[PDB]
Amino acid sequence: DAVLELPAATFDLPLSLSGGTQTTLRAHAGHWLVIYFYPKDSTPGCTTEGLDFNALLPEFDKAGAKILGVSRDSVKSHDNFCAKQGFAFPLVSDGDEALCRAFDVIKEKNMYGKQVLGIERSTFLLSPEGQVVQAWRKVKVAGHADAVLAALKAHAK
Ligand code: NA
Ligand code: NA
Numbered sequence: 095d096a097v098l099e100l101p102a103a104t105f106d107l108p109l110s111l112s113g114g115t116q117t118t119l120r121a122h123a124g125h126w127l128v129i130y131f132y133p134k135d136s137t138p139g140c141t142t143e144g145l146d147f148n149a150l151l152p153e154f155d156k157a158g159a160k161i162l163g164v165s166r167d168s169v170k171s172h173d174n175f176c177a178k179q180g181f182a183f184p185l186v187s188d189g190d191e192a193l194c195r196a197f198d199v200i201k202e203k204n205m206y207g208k209q210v211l212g213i214e215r216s217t218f219l220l221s222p223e224g225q226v227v228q229a230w231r232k233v234k235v236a237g238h239a240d241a242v243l244a245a246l247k248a249h250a251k
C-alpha cells in the first residue's frame with residue numbers, strides 16, 4: 095500500500111518546529127499524519143493553503159489525524175507566520191531540506207539558462223504505522239485541503 099518508500103533514517107530526523115520544540119515522524123506512530131510541503135512562508139498561495147487546513151482542523155481531529163506544514167523557512171519566520179495567521183498546527187523548519195529530500199519534493203527546472211532547484215508544493219498522508227499511502231505532487235491550492243481530508247477519511251475507514 096505504500097506509494098513512496100522513505101529512507102529508514104527519515105523517521106528519526108529531528109524536525110525543528112514553530113514554537114521551539116522538535117518532533118520526529120516516528121514520534122507520530124499511532125495516528126494519521128498529513129505532511130504538506132509549501133514553498134514560502136507568508137506568500138499568497140502558502141497562506142491560503144495553511145488557512146484552508148486550519149479551518150478544517152476539527153475534521154482532522156475527528157478522523158484521528160495531525161497536520162504538519164513544511165518549508166525551509168526559519169523557526170522565527172514560522173513563528174511569525176503562525177502567529178499572524180492563527181495556525182493551530184505546527185510548521186517544520188526544514189532548513190537543510192532533509193525532510194524535503196526524503197519525500198523527493200526538491201525539483202529541478204531548466205530556466206534562466208541554468209538548473210534551478212526548488213520546493214514543489216506537495217502533500218502526503220502517513221498511516222499510523224508510518225507508511226506513505228497517498229501523495230499529491232505539484233499541488234493546486236484551491237480545493238486541496240478538502241481533497242486531502244476526503245482521502246484521509248477514505249483511508250482511515
Ligand atoms: Na531544532
Ligand atoms: Na532543524
Ligand code: NA
Nearest residue numbers: 110114115116
Ligand atoms: Na529546540
Ligand code: NA
Nearest residue numbers: 122127221222
Ligand atoms: Na504516523
Ligand code: NA
Nearest residue numbers: 228229230231
Ligand atoms: Na496521488
